[PDB]
Design a protein around this nucleic acid. Structure first.
Length: 48
DNA sequence: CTTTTTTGCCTAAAATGTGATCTAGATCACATTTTTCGCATCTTTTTTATGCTATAATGTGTGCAGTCTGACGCGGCG
């Protein structure tokens, strides 16, 4: 519960970077960003 | 006196009237087979909610405004 938050805070820039490809005028910035945080945190739960 | 027109008769003849006596018709309230309908099964059949993909990738702006403006509020701004 502590240790992962480090990793989570780490790659925020990969998150936002990949997000801002499909920020064509499809939806909105931060919504893509939030769902990217989601997909991340689930990638975090599983990684080997 | 002769004609024709009429009626009545001859002479043949259809239409009228006896009602008594049946006889095939139509009624008449209530049980049975057909339509094919409606909701439950199947039962598919399609469609839909959900689930993974292990080289590697790390701070925006993003296309615009053309900036109205005069008075008054109000936070400063001294």
């Amino acid at each position: 519960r502590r240790a992962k938050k480090e990793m989570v805070e780490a790659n925020l820039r990969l998150v936002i970077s990949i997000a801002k490809k499909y920020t064509n005028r499809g939806l909105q910035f931060l919504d893509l960003i939030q769902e990217g945080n989601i997909g991340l945190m689930k990638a975090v739960d599983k990684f080997e």
